[PDB]
From Swiss-Prot, chain A:
Residues of the full protein shown: 53 to 526 of 662
Job of this protein: Probable modulatory (alpha) subunit of inward-rectifying potassium channels. Could mediate potassium uptake from the soil solution by plant roots in association with AKT1.
Protein name: Potassium channel KAT3
Domain-related comment: The segment S4 is probably the voltage-sensor and is characterized by a series of positively charged amino acids. The pore-forming region H5 is enclosed by the transmembrane segments S5 and S6 in the Shaker-type (1P/6TM) and contains the GYGD signature motif which seems to be involved in potassium selectivity.
GO CC annotations on file: endoplasmic reticulum; monoatomic ion channel complex; plasma membrane
Topology feature Extracellular, residues: 60-66, 133-142, 199-225, 246-249
Biological process terms in GO annotation: potassium ion transmembrane transport; response to nematode
Domain of life from the UniProt record: Eukaryota
From Swiss-Prot, chain C:
Protein name (database record): Potassium channel AKT1
Regions of this protein lying in the Extracellular compartment: 32-39, 105-107, 164-190, 211-214
Any single GO CC term annotated in Swiss-Prot or TrEMBL for this entry: monoatomic ion channel complex
Binding site residues for a nucleoside 3',5'-cyclic phosphate: 321-440
Induction record: In roots, strongly reduced after 2,4-dichlorophenoxyacetic acid (2,4-D) treatment and weakly reduced after benzyladenine (BA) treatment. In shoots, strongly reduced after abscisic acid (ABA) treatment and induced after benzyladenine (BA) treatment.
Residue ranges of coiled coil: none
UniProt subunit comment: The potassium channel is probably composed of a homo- or heterotetrameric complex of pore-forming subunits. Possible heteromultimer with AKT2 or KAT3. Part of a K(+)-channel calcium-sensing kinase/phosphatase complex composed by a calcium sensor CBL (CBL1, CBL2, CBL3 or CBL9), a kinase CIPK (CIPK6, CIPK16 or CIPK23), a phosphatase PP2C (AIP1) and a K(+)-channel (AKT1). Interacts directly with AIP1, CBL10, CIPK6, CIPK16 and CIPK23.
Length: 474, 441, 440, 441
């Protein structure tokens, strides 16, 4: 179950034998054995995108293997065009799994996606070859296999759902997506420029007809190689100067191409800059802290025993500042946060020295309202003479007891996991007559004085002189 | 001074500025005398710009000093006539007359009226400091116009340099085509533009390069300009890349932190998915602007009560607990109620729980199931507008029925202690209890 | 040391440093012996650079260990001598002396004069840390100068390589210009300057490319250098652009999602702009507030005390409590008294909580609002010079009469513990605070 | 393991790597059979790498899971023997045997010796993780090396697919040089390196371009590689520039929004001088140490009171006050003393004020400038380790004399409140007042 499965693993999850959403004659859009099929379809899109431009420009690929190859791709895409009737879909505004065939059908048909896919899937050139005797020709008729570029939306969806999955590197996925869009545009520009040169009258005034005269007679892969080479040398801005624009059509298309290329390449450099800058944002911030420590301890002459007491400490500060970012449930609804808090802290809380013998009502009103903090191994949580707003129940690590005195300080007691601290002040309402400092990376639970007291003496009535009994025992 | 009748207009003089920004340098470069097809469509634009140097006296200018329009006729007159008057006045003298005073000044004259480009500069400064406009496509378009205009005026200067030269066969363009002075203006413009873009972009094929020293000198400065312009472009495209990339990039960090949290504490694999569902829901209903606490908490409750009022007041009296109550207590209630969303099939309230909260439905629906040696005992359902867990709270007995969402619900929450201390006003609690007792009957 | 006359003499030498940075490579490359039009200007410039050598014995230097200008003669002399005196001296020996010493050194000798560029380096290092100068336009003028210098030096070195070649028609410039050793000096300089820009820029038209291996090697190293130089220019521009607007995208999105929500549920226009106003107001009054961390860094309490005195000292004599206590203790109390800003209609001291902060207001309009049984009313609207929240901190009692603002009020906070550990010492005051406190 | 001589030896097999990185591509591309001037040097290197094949048994193998370095003489011999053994072994096989077994392999075979490049990557990993090495000079060198290596391998491959072409005239190099197979290896190598660096830097003059389809495909892939490589280089250079200038940019914002704070106020320029004279000085004593406060305070008070005891203890005990006092009182109050710096000609304690604080000098000097109604005269020369203004605070009389720093010196502040709260905690008040009234003699 859950709305997390459909919206989180990029390739879906394993469906076990008795999922409650499973139904007869339905496949769930988040199933793995589907989000793997619809990746096979993306692998096929990677070929259809290439082939559509290729046989648009080159016009002699049809009389060969590519014509029969894109039929067994116009089949797998016709299988899916009916398979998407038994496919659930996450309903917005009611985050359910619509699973009635009627509603799936009605949402599919009423969308442009259905007619666009039934167009893109139509093998019109094979239709011509079977009705007539051959494809044969066309300066514009070959524009029909440009519909197959509609399939490119699947690659968009894939890259869109790989950049929300956090198991995959975020900027790295953007750089591979940018690399794919580039080598697609290199292909598009190469084929378009070859198309322009192929249908030009008097072919010796083209960009390719000047170098190789009979380019209309050579194997299509010589032409394809020349075009890819040209588009690469003007994409990358090398520009050797052989293979330049000769007539006005090529000049115009070419200066539109290399006008868009400025923005494309500046984009690529921007993406790589952000990748590099963010990937090395924390390592430096940690290094810039070890640096000034060494500078300060070397300008002065501190011994290198108390210079590895500052280095072996700030590591703890980085760790503890990181551990309070793994605090995420500061916004989740209370009805659920008060269940994580339950499962985590009810044991620690109910068998505490003072809470003993409390009814479950106040226990839950407590556990629901607490939140945990962390503390470096030497900071003091509460020092003496403050007015007692808080008192802590430590869950891990330790905390040492000290007081105020003429002498520096004295270590009285060591507190272990599951023990209260600083409660004398918060109970007796007198300012905190003690000081408590940690001795290891420890986790604490704080309780506001006002809310705790108003809660204990108002919500429940069955609480009297047993807290006194236990309080007196100490 | 502010209405549409001065915004469908002042933004109509911007398509007339884009026209002048193409025509003026083209006249400079490629033409020497006012040929017909442009010597009449350039007085039209002059009239339209002459209409505006008078319709700018009857226009209120607002300073932040006055914080509002001025409406003072003489003040507007003297304020306009101070700085942008002589420029706007000369910009619209017809070329056809400025040639009568001194010929050979035609080309250089119709480049004064590039002063009008201040209106495009102004429109962009306006578009950037405004919303409803995708900021990614008003910086990926200002730089594009700067680039196109630079390319254009460079082409038109570099062709003039070659046209005003003796022995045209020693120019940058005469080197390629023997007789370029006998080709269509389309051809020469396309060739100039082609060179200018091959140079701007640093491709540099190598045909169409400088030949003599005037062209070499011009090209030195053109390349020096482009070197800075390209670095400036790459400096901006780095900003626009981290844009809208801060809510899909924090979501990844949120999910990662949640996974680490569930790891360290060894949470069972039932609260982990229950937590991830809510975390994803918070990101879905943030892409829809359905609810943003970070834009509600930021305001003080003295304002943040008016929004909650306008959004829930109408709903808050069609509930049987608050039939007859002075509106002030109702206002205090609707003030301190936090709205929170819930994914489908989740237990906001489960049976035999310590009663602590009570919710009010505003969206969706939900069922009141009960389990007693058996689930699936649907007893009833609730619709947007009813209240749940009220008797369990106001009677301090454990919850009676268990509520599970059936859609993407949204609820208004109020815990017990706040409701109790806010009900400690006058006897209205009597009305409340009277209502709840007559409710079940 | 610092006189305006000296600071303009030093800025006038930079003018001739820019002249040297062009003339030295120019005669290294294009000339083989001193010629009148340039052999007398350089001597003038050497004269000034020689006078500077004798006057840099009469300028004090700021000792970085004790920030004093040393008017001692001998220390100045010896410091200069050790640091760089002979280097500044060979930098001004006239080229006629070198020619009389040995010919064929005129070129390589007046490249030592490029030692003077330390002055322009120091000038830039001095400007980009000044506050009266735009950092953008100053950092851009350095990238421009470095680039122009690199282009010029490469032009001159490349032409030198072509001119010293035995066969002149086997060179990069000799390939196009048949007889370039008889063309003008202006045309030759322009051609080689144009080559080195289609190369630094990476246009590379294709005419004027290397022909033999010496040129290929020079060009290999030049293009290697240019790779790094261009990466460095782009890295500097990307930093001038990105840092200039760093928070604007944060403020923009937190102020735009507000509109998204306010017009996703169709909020009325009258109300939906009060929230945007309060947003764009709170974004200022907190930034302006944390900009008062410059009192935590000017932390020497003989300075921050004088600031916090001048800002609000007359105020602390028109208050209800401190009317007639004393002057001395007032100084130390106001010196531990820090100000805060609050947007309109926010609460500073909510009723019924633990007394911690004694507050004082200087301007703005705040109200003494009271929370009723189930409603809210007011008793008073506190104005300038009046104390709020004093009721409770001196009593240990929970606070009364919650306070709310109407605009920015610029309050003045004094905390509980600080107050009491102040009053325990200096026991001259005590019960006089009360004497005027329980007066009402 | 970590020995001094060992680390020196490993850092010697690295220059031998740098040698192989140049030589193995060079024999791949440019040579067909071993030649003396090189077939004698790459046998030496093979001996020096075979030596390290045996010496890598007697090494201190270290595991990360257990911080102990395994000094066992037989567990290292079973880990190294697992992963990098046959690789490092075949890499040092002399090519004279690989030819004996099969000719036409000398090229592709000794390209295996590129396997000894893991050493360079390991050395760079060790360098950047280190802290004694400027991150600038360690990152801006891994890029130079990978760039030079790419340029070199591209040169050799592009020459190899030209030397093996069945007709040397239709090649990328035979189009310029008639017979390039009869030229010095120096000249051929330079031409190839020149081509490859012209196409990596995107200059692309136009001489030396692909001529047939094999070179075209190689070049397509090479330029695709260069696109990403250059984007990566610009990314790293931007990262270097951003962090390199991050300091000045912060001092500038400090001065900016500390003049602003004086503008949204009306401060007389005199104190607007001392403020900017103290802020700048605060930045010159932070780029140099001695005042790294916002680091020192982020430490626990159990260390921040151990540092400021190692510095100011052997200083404070020499004051004429604190003559006889328990060491622990010293250690206690010295813990709490905020050290601050002062520019010269600055009045720290100007005469006739409230005696609030008292300072102790550690550096610099000043004098007790004595000002009557109208006069300025000085009688004192305070040095390191002397009190000031304490007579005022220990008698609550107004300050005796002005004090003006005559240099730049740092003092220790200790307010009267904290001092009186400390002194009562002990009985040393007796000895303090004793010494103090004794000072009057
Ligand atoms: C002048 C004007 C201004 C110009 C501005 C330039 C900006 C360009 C960015 C466009 C972009 O990223 O696309 C965006 C949308 O589209 C996608 O994300 C599609 C991703 C791939 C689609 C096709 C992949 C090809 C398949 C492979 C086939 C190989 C073919 C055969 C190969 C031989 C994503 O952008 P963003 O960054 O998320 O925002
Ligand atoms: C060394 C030398 C170095 C110099 C290097 C220069 C760097 C470039 C900076 C310039 C710049 O960006 O301008 C600024 C302002 O820009 C404007 O105000 C935009 C106005 C648009 C111009 C006209 C557009 C009409 C296009 C019509 C088409 C014409 C016809 C085209 C025909 C096809 C940038 O924005 P910012 O953030 O304020 O800064
Ligand atoms: C592969 C390798 C890669 C190498 C690539 C590295 C890039 C080089 C950068 C060097 C640099 O920034 O200098 C640094 C030194 O301080 C300076 O800024 C020096 C100032 C320049 C003096 C020259 C100006 C002469 C006047 C011009 C007269 C023109 C002559 C006439 C022209 C017609 C600045 O560093 P930063 O400031 O910390 O940043
Ligand atoms: C589309 C296609 C896109 C392709 C994208 C490619 C771009 C990035 C390239 C790879 C790369 O970045 O390397 C990584 C280094 O990797 C290493 O481990 C460094 C080892 C360097 C070898 C040095 C040999 C020195 C010999 C020198 C002598 C040679 C002789 C020269 C004589 C002239 C980069 O750093 P990082 O740590 O990964 O971060
Ligand atoms: K280029
Ligand atoms: K180029
Ligand atoms: K070129």
């Amino acid at each position: 179950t859950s709305v997390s499965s459909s919206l989180l693993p990029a390739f879906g999850t394993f469906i076990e034998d008795d999922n409650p959403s499973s139904k007869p004659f339905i496949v769930l859009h988040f199933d793995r054995r589907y989000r793997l099929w619809e990746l096979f379809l993306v692998i096929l899109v990677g070929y259809s995108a290439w082939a559509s431009l290729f046989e648009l420009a080159f016009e002699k690929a049809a009389e060969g293997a590519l014509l029969t190859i894109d039929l067994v791709v116009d089949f797998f895409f016709a299988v899916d065009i009916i398979l998407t009737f038994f496919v659930s879909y996450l309903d917005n505004t009611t985050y359910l799994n619509v699973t009635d065939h009627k509603l799936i059908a009605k949402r599919y048909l009423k969308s442009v996606a259905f007619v666009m896919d039934v167009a893109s899937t139509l093998p019109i050139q094979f239709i011509y070859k079977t009705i007539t005797g051959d494809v044969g020709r066309g300066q514009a008729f070959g524009f029909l296999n440009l519909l197959r570029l509609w399939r490119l939306r699947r690659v968009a969806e894939l890259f869109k759902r790989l950049e929300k999955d956090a198991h995959f590197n975020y900027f790295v996925i953007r750089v591979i997506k940018l690399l794919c869009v580039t080598i697609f545009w290199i292909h598009l520009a190469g084929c378009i420029l070859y198309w322009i040169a192929y249908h030009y009258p008097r072919p010796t005034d083209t960009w390719i007809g000047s170098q190789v005269e009979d380019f209309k007679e050579r194997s299509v892969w010589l032409g394809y190689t020349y075009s890819m080479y040209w588009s690469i040398v003007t994409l990358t801005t090398v520009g050797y100067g052989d293979l330049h624009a000769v007539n006005s059509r090529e000049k115009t298309f070419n200066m539109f191409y290399m006008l868009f290329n400025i923005d494309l390449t500046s984009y690529i450099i921007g993406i790589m800059t952000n990748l590099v800058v963010h990937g090395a944002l924390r390592t430096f911030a940690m290094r810039s802290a070890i640096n000034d420590i060494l500078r300060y301890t070397s300008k002065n002459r501190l011994p290198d025993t108390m210079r590895e007491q500052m280095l072996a400490h700030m590591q703890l500060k980085f760790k503890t500042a990181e551990l309070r970012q793994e605090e995420v449930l500061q916004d989740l609804p209370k009805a659920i946060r008060s269940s994580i808090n339950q499962h985590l802290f009810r044991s620690i809380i109910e068998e505490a020295y003072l809470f003993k013998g409390f009814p479950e009502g106040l226990l839950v009103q407590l556990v629901s309202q607490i939140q945990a903090e962390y503390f470096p191994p030497k900071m003091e949580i509460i020092l003496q003479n403050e007015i007692p707003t808080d008192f802590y129940v430590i869950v891990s690590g330790g905390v040492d007891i000290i007081a105020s005195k003429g002498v520096s300080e004295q270590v009285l007691a060591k507190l272990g996991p599951g023990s209260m601290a600083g409660e004398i002040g918060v109970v007796f309402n007198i300012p905190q007559p003690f000081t408590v400092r940690t001795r290891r990376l420890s986790q604490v639970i704080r309780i506001g004085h006002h809310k705790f007291k108003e809660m204990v003496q108002s919500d429940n009535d069955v609480d009297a002189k047993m807290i006194i009994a236990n309080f007196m025992t100490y | 001074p502010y209405d549409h009748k001065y915004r469908i207009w002042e933004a109509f003089l911007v398509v007339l500025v884009v026209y002048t920004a193409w025509v003026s340098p083209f006249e400079f470069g490629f033409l020497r005398k006012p040929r017909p097809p442009l010597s009449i469509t350039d007085n039209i634009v002059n009239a339209f710009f002459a209409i505006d140097i008078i319709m700018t006296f009857f226009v209120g200018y607002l300073d932040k000093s006055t914080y509002l329009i001025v409406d003072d006729r003489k003040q507007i007159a003297f304020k306009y006539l101070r700085s942008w008057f002589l420029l706007d006045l000369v910009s619209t003298i017809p070329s056809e007359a400025a040639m009568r005073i001194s010929s050979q000044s035609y080309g250089l004259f119709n480049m004064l009226r590039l002063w009008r480009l201040r209106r495009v500069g102004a429109l962009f400064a306006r578009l950037e400091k405004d919303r409803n406009f995708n900021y990614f496509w008003v910086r990926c378009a200002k730089l594009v116009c700067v680039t196109l205009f630079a390319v254009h005026c460079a082409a038109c200067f570099y062709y003039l340099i070659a046209a005003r030269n003796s022995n045209p066969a020693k120019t940058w363009i005469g080197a390629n085509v023997a007789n370029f002075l006998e080709e269509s203006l389309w051809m020469r413009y396309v060739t100039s533009m082609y060179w200018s873009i091959t140079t701007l972009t640093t491709v540099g094929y190598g045909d169409l390069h400088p030949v003599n020293t005037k062209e070499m000198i011009f090209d030195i400065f053109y390349m020096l300009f482009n070197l800075g312009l390209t670095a400036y472009l790459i400096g901006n495209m780095t900003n626009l890349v981290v844009h809208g990339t801060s809510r899909t990039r924090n979501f990844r960090d949120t999910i990662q932190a949640a996974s680490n949290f569930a790891h360290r504490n060894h949470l069972p694999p039932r609260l982990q998915d229950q937590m991830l569902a809510h975390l994803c829901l918070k990101y879905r209903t943030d892409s829809e602007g359905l609810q943003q606490q970070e834009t509600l908490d930021a305001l003080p409750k003295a304002i943040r009560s008016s929004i909650s009022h306008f959004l829930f007041y109408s709903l808050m009296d069609k509930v049987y607990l608050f039939r007859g109550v002075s509106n002030d207590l109702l206002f205090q209630l609707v003030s301190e109620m936090k709205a929170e969303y819930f994914p489908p099939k989740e237990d906001v309230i489960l049976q035999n729980e310590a009663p602590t909260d009570f919710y009010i439905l505003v969206n969706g629906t939900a069922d009141l199931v009960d389990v007693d040696t058996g689930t699936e005992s649907i007893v009833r359902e609730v619709k947007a507008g009813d209240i749940i867990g009220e008797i369990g709270v106001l009677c301090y007995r454990p919850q009676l029925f268990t509520v599970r969402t059936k859609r993407l619900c949204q609820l208004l929450r109020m815990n017990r202690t706040t409701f109790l201390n806010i009900i400690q006003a006058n006897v209205g609690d009597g009305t409340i209890i009277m209502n709840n007792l007559l409710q079940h009957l």
